[PDB]
Design a protein around this ligand. Structure first.
Ligand SMILES: *[C@@H]1O[C@H](CO[C@@H]2O[C@@H](C)[C@@H](O)[C@@H](O)[C@@H]2O)[C@@H](O[C@@H]2O[C@H](CO)[C@@H](O)[C@H](O)[C@H]2NC(C)=O)[C@H](O)[C@H]1NC(C)=O
Ligand SMILES: *[C@@H]1O[C@H](CO)[C@@H](O[C@@H]2O[C@H](CO)[C@@H](O)[C@H](O)[C@H]2NC(C)=O)[C@H](O)[C@H]1NC(C)=O
Ligand SMILES: *[C@@H]1O[C@H](CO)[C@@H](O[C@@H]2O[C@H](CO)[C@@H](O)[C@H](O)[C@H]2NC(C)=O)[C@H](O)[C@H]1NC(C)=O
Ligand SMILES: *[C@@H]1O[C@H](CO)[C@@H](O[C@@H]2O[C@H](CO)[C@@H](O)[C@H](O)[C@H]2NC(C)=O)[C@H](O)[C@H]1NC(C)=O
Ligand SMILES: *[C@@H]1O[C@H](CO)[C@@H](O)[C@H](O)[C@H]1NC(C)=O
Ligand SMILES: *[C@@H]1O[C@H](CO)[C@@H](O)[C@H](O)[C@H]1NC(C)=O
Ligand SMILES: *[C@@H]1O[C@H](CO)[C@@H](O)[C@H](O)[C@H]1NC(C)=O
Ligand SMILES: *[C@@H]1O[C@H](CO)[C@@H](O)[C@H](O)[C@H]1NC(C)=O
Ligand SMILES: *[C@@H]1O[C@H](CO)[C@@H](O)[C@H](O)[C@H]1NC(C)=O
Ligand SMILES: *[C@@H]1O[C@H](CO)[C@@H](O)[C@H](O)[C@H]1NC(C)=O
Ligand SMILES: *[C@@H]1O[C@H](CO)[C@@H](O)[C@H](O)[C@H]1NC(C)=O
Ligand SMILES: *[C@@H]1O[C@H](CO)[C@@H](O)[C@H](O)[C@H]1NC(C)=O
Lengths: 98, 142, 294, 327, 226
């Protein structure tokens, strides 16, 4: 409820001792958000969607650095039977940057 | 449970070492300023320590020290000792006190109480003359 | 030998620089005081103004494991007077040269049984236009069956020739005639790419490093950032498909005339292995002081 | 065997009378203000209360020790400090002109950072000590202001010339410093004849001895090294709490927000539990170290009180208790 | 990165000197930007300290901005038993912060200025006065103290210095001496913890509580009880 409530539950008693007591500090609210660094062309997923997909022992690798990727452009056309993500959340790939 | 017991064992060892050090300190205090009157300034009694009493306490040892406490200080005129004008070689100095100028002349007082009293031979010692002493030629102390 | 206290051949942190701090970094690094794999290039035979048969070393038959990449110091002997390799009694100005690199994962013998054949896709680094261009390609190479050719008769070794009578003129560059000289011996099939890089010609010593990760082959240099200093800095990320196991150096000869035989510099190779270095990042963030742990 | 020549030697000693009073905000340090973090922290509960109680008890113990020693060194009666104190005996290094010259020299020559007691929030706002706010703890102000500590030393400097003349703390005899030195030199076994005839040379020797240590404040002084070691000990103790926040203790990240942003709740629960366990173990180790250092500080404060009660207000005859040779 | 509508209020120069939640294209956090001089290398665009904390960022306009921290304000409380009197303190900060930008749960005060500038910071709930107390039992810090009323808010006093009884120094052969005239016997009570209570624990009884399968699972450890 207030400071003194936290002070009382810090001792598990309704009677405390007179004294200066350190208590949990407070945080200043953010004033806004900034998102700004160098950007370029969107990431290209065309050769992934074109041609015969190769075998599992001959998997084709695509690297992406300094580009813009939107999962709504390619995962929407993906008839995803199974979606798993290990040591990462499935929704992290849609928003987080690397 | 074993981690908690090991922590308790470590805490018990630390408290036992602290208890041994405090017991040595208590033995020192009861050997110095209980069976005798220690002259150490505030070793076990604030101010000039007079006497001590030792009783038991449900975990330890309880001391009560009766000590001297001054009050109502006054400002006076004092010297370093009396010498003869005719015989500058002979010089006396106060013993456990000071030479205080008090009228109805020079007088002696204690080191812890304003008690003017006439200067005699039972409270002074002879000493080599210096430049800073206070010579006298009209009322020579005995 | 490389002096780590003199800050030679240290790979910078890849994306997180620092400033004015001493920090311990674990990564791919060389040992202090390695003699390395110093190699030297020489000009071919010439009588007057006739460019005669080549004069190269035996490095085509030498192969070493790629391991964890390696660093190469370029032009450490230039801006000085030194002897000519083909003519020991001749002393000329030492000029910096840039080396040719051959990397792969298969090792085999030639038609005459000599070591040096690399099967399948092979990474080739080759300078051109008197070293202004830095062409690179991980492509398929095919031997030729002609005279003095790898699949043909009278075969000894393969090399790349340079003729600065027409290559090193003003402008010009004889349209990438070192690529011509390489294709005079080999053929290019199912080529994956063709990366070109520009370096202005000068007489300042520089550094280079190569390594591989799951992302690909990373090429680090000081020409992009630290011209007057010297440190690794990311300029090339080759998208390799396979792990590189072995590497080798292409021999190179110069078709200079005998009356104008000019001395060429010798380069060095120092291998990289994982260590934990201690680095002093200065106010500008450049590496100038570094000490080892082993 | 008898000596024929003598010198005054300065011996410099340091006593760590108390460590710096520090406290930590448990939920702020371990949790950094995240809601799911707070929900995963509330099952532990009284651990924050336990460490807060331990740190507050240690701070109150140090505060009681400081108050007790300052009551012990509180002189009953002192003397004013004037320029030209001590006459021919040059002691103006100890003269307060606020602090004194020797104290300002000692504070200048030791690497000391002011912990932002006026505008430390502004110090982190506009322009290593900035980390004591962002990392989730604080350093308590000392019980005395600098200004008052000083008085206390001014009173002690005024009373040392007077108390050390006759046994018994009841009276005060604030003789000028030169005759106090003469009486002490008579008391330590030197005849009054040589004191009466050789005041100038012993005055020059005392002045040279005092002036020698003014430029000696460097690595060669053992007490200066001990002061620097204590300051570095405090710096390392605070640098722990400022440093192993970045430690992950097996987690894949050192940020709670990045963990809850990147991970599924079954696995972010385990990651946050590992982070909480590591931070709480580190905090308990820091609490134990703080308790050990506080007990050491209390014992050293008792030793300092004993030394200032024995061989500061009086001339101790103990052989090298606080001064090598005859003190 | 994903595509995002970049509004005009996302540049660094728009929100200089303000605590903002920065997402530098994958580098997430909250902090305060400031203007500094160019330090480091331009190509890497990210600098760290020895403790892996971001220090600065090279913006796309060619300006370097130091990213330091979204610094918070500590709070302490002074509370008295048997007189329901309490006040709050913000440590080592000028009196600038008011009740607007709040976090945690809540806070409360009494009926009504309210702040107060002190060497320890900014104080809510105290009235200042020119009082001097030699026996302060609620030591706030530096030399400030709170005096509960015996019932309004506590008076703010300074911890005074008991000046000892001054005696003058005469630069002549005489002397000015100070001597007590009256005395008392004072009792000083001391305690020494000479020994702690002797306690022992039965290892198998305490840890196991007399169960057979428990005993079998305990016997592998063995000498720990010993
Ligand atoms: C709070 O603390 C003191 C309180 O002293 C007051 O002095 C009068 C002005 C009056 O308001 C009485 O109620 C109090 O006794 C104040 O500090 C004063 O600051 C002014 C301005 O610098 C200065 O002239 C005075 O000398 C200060 N007072 C003393 C005793 O030194 C002030 O009201 C508050 N403090 C601050 C820092 O604002
Ligand atoms: C006390 O009387 C003596 C003799 O008349 C004088 O003091 C002497 O002064 C000389 C000069 O420096 C010193 O060397 C002696 O040691 C002094 N003797 C004593 C006993 O002090 C002077 O008249 C008086 N001295 C005082 C008042 O200090
Ligand atoms: C970089 O770090 C060095 C090392 O501390 C700083 O240089 C010191 O500055 C202090 C300040 O007076 C001097 O007393 C030391 O002698 C200096 N040491 C050295 C080795 O120069 C330097 O100020 C820092 N620079 C920046 C830009 O942060
Ligand atoms: C006592 O010693 C101090 C220290 O040597 C003297 O202070 C110095 O005085 C000179 C002359 O004014 C200055 O040049 C120095 O800078 C001073 N040093 C310091 C550390 O302050 C002082 O003058 C001496 N006093 C007497 C009466 O001899
Ligand atoms: C006698 O001494 C007392 C005590 O100092 C003083 O008050 C008084 O004035 C003195 N008398 C004379 C006549 O000097
Ligand atoms: C090539 O020459 C070097 C130079 O000494 C030598 O070490 C190496 O064995 C030679 N290799 C072959 C295959 O002759
Ligand atoms: C080159 O590509 C062609 C086109 O499919 C293929 O038939 C041939 O086998 C490839 N050769 C090599 C060596 O990869
Ligand atoms: C190198 O410079 C030449 C000279 O203009 C230019 O034609 C060429 O495109 C440049 N190549 C690269 C990769 O910058
Ligand atoms: C005492 O020793 C010092 C140096 O050791 C010397 O300068 C001085 O002359 C000596 N004095 C006597 C009286 O021997
Ligand atoms: C910020 O600093 C840079 C270089 O230190 C300077 O060029 C620029 O004008 C500064 N801007 C402001 C608003 O102070
Ligand atoms: C102190 O000395 C000065 C100068 O010698 C003198 O004028 C003054 O009277 C003296 N003070 C006392 C109290 O004797
Ligand atoms: C001593 O002081 C006490 C109280 O402080 C007082 O009652 C008593 O009368 C005093 N005695 C003398 C002799 O002044």
């Amino acid at each position: 409820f207030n400071d003194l409530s936290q002070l009382h539950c810090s001792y598990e008693s309704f009677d405390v001792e007179s004294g200066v007591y350190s208590v949990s500090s407070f945080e200043a609210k953010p004033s806004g958000s900034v998102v700004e660094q160098a950007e370029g062309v969107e990431c290209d997923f065309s050769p992934l969607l074109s041609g015969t997909p190769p075998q599992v022992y001959n998997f084709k690798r695509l690297v992406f650095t300094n580009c813009n990727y939107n999962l709504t452009k390619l995962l929407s056309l993906f008839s995803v039977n199974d979606f798993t993500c290990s040591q990462i959340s499935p929704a992290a790939i849609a928003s987080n940057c690397y | 449970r074993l981690t908690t017991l090991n922590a308790f064992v470590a805490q018990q060892l630390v408290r036992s070492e602290s208890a041994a050090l405090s017991a040595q300190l208590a033995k020192d205090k009861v050997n110095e300023c209980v069976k005798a009157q220690s002259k150490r300034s505030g070793f076990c009694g604030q101010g000039t320590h007079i006497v001590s009493f030792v009783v038991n306490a449900p975990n330890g040892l309880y001391f009560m020290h009766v000590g001297y406490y001054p009050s109502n200080h006054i400002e006076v005129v004092s010297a370093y000792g009396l010498c003869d004008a005719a015989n500058p070689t002979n010089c006396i100095a106060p013993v456990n006190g000071y030479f205080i100028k008090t009228n109805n002349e020079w007088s002696y007082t204690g080191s812890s109480f304003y008690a003017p009293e006439p200067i005699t031979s039972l409270n002074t010692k002879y000493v080599a003359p210096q430049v800073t002493y206070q010579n006298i030629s009209t009322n020579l102390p005995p | 030998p490389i002096d780590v206290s003199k800050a030679d051949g240290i790979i910078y942190p890849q994306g997180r620089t620092y400033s004015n701090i001493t920090i311990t970094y674990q990564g791919l690094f060389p040992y202090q005081g390695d003699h390395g794999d110093m190699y030297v290039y020489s000009a071919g035979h010439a009588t007057g103004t006739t460019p005669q048969k080549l004069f190269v070393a035996n490095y085509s038959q030498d192969v070493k494991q790629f391991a964890n990449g390696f660093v190469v110091r370029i032009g450490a002997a230039a801006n000085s007077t030194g002897t000519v390799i083909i003519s020991p009694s001749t002393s000329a100005t030492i000029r910096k040269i840039y080396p040719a690199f051959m990397l792969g994962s298969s090792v085999g013998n030639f038609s005459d049984g000599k070591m040096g054949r690399f099967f399948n896709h092979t990474l080739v680094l080759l300078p051109d236009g008197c070293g202004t261009l830095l062409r690179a390609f991980y492509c398929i190479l095919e031997p030729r069956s002609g005279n003095h050719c790898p699949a043909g008769n009278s075969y000894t070794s393969f090399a790349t020739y340079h003729t600065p009578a027409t290559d090193c003129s003003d402008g010009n560059y004889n349209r990438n005639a070192s690529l011509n000289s390489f294709k005079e011996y080999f053929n290019l099939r199912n080529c994956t790419f063709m990366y070109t890089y520009n370096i202005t010609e000068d007489e300042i010593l520089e550094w280079f490093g190569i390594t591989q990760t799951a992302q690909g082959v990373h090429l680090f240099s000081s020409r992009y950032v630290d011209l007057y200093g010297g440190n690794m800095f990311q300029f090339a990320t080759l998208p390799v498909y396979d792990t590189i196991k072995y590497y080798s150096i292409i021999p190179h000869s110069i078709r200079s005339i005998q009356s104008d035989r000019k001395a060429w510099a010798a380069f060095y190779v120092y291998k990289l292995q994982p260590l934990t270095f201690l680095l002093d990042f200065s106010v500008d963030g450049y590496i100038r002081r570094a000490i080892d742990c082993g | 065997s008898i000596p024929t020549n003598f010198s005054f030697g300065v011996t410099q000693e340091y006593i760590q009378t108390t460590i710096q009073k520090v406290t930590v905000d448990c939920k702020q340090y371990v949790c950094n203000g995240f809601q799911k973090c707070e929900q995963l922290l509330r099952e532990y509960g009284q651990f924050c209360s336990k460490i807060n109680q331990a740190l507050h008890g240690a701070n109150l113990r140090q505060d009681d020790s400081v108050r007790n020693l300052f009551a012990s060194v509180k002189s009953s009666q002192s003397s004013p400090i004037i320029p030209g104190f001590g006459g021919d005996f040059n002691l103006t290094l100890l003269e307060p002109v606020a602090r004194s010259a020797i104290e300002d020299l000692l504070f200048d020559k030791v690497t000391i950072a002011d912990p932002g007691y006026m505008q430390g929030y502004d110090d982190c706002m506009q322009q290593l000590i900035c980390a004591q706010y962002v990392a989730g703890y604080k350093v308590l102000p000392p019980l005395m202001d600098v200004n008052m500590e000083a008085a206390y030393t001014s009173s002690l400097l005024g009373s040392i010339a007077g108390v050390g003349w006759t046994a018994g703390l009841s009276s005060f005899a604030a003789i000028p410093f030169a005759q106090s030195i003469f009486y002490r030199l008579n008391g330590v076994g030197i005849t009054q004849q040589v004191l009466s005839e050789n005041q100038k040379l012993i005055a020059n020797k005392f002045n040279q001895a005092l002036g020698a240590m003014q430029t000696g404040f460097t690595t060669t002084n053992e007490a200066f090294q001990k002061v620097q070691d204590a300051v570095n000990n405090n710096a390392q103790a605070l640098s722990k709490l400022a440093s192993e926040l970045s430690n992950t203790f097996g987690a894949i990240s050192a940020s709670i927000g990045d963990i809850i942003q990147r991970l599924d709740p079954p696995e972010q629960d385990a990651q946050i539990d590992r982070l909480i366990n590591g931070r709480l173990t580190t905090l308990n180790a820091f609490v134990a170290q703080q308790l050990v250092r506080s007990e050491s500080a209390a014992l050293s404060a008792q030793l300092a009180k004993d030394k200032v009660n024995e061989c500061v207000k009086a001339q101790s005859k103990r052989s090298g208790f606080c001064g090598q040779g005859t003190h | 990165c994903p595509k995002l509508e970049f509004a005009n209020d996302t540049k660094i120069a728009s929100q200089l000197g303000n605590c903002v939640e920065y997402s530098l294209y994958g580098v997430s956090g909250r902090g305060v930007f400031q203007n500094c001089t160019a330090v480091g290398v331009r190509q890497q665009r990210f600098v760290y300290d020895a403790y892996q904390n971001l220090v600065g960022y090279y913006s796309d306009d060619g300006n370097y901005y130091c990213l330091r921290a979204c610094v918070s304000v500590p709070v302490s409380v002074i509370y008295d038993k048997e007189t329901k009197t309490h006040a709050t303190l913000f440590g080592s900060v000028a009196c600038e912060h008011i009740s607007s930008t709040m976090s945690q749960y809540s806070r409360s005060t009494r009926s009504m200025y309210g702040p107060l500038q002190t060497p320890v910071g900014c104080v809510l709930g105290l009235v200042n006065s020119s009082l001097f107390v030699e026996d302060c039992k609620l030591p706030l810090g530096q030399s400030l103290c709170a005096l509960p009323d015996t019932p309004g808010e506590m008076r703010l006093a300074s911890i005074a210095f008991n000046h000892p009884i001054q005696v003058d120094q005469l630069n002549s052969s005489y002397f000015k001496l100070s001597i007590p005239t009256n005395f008392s016997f004072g009792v000083t009570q001391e305690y020494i913890q000479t020994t702690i209570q002797k306690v022992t624990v039965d290892c198998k009884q305490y840890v196991c509580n007399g169960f057979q399968k428990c005993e079998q699972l305990l016997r592998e450890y063995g000498q720990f009880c010993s």
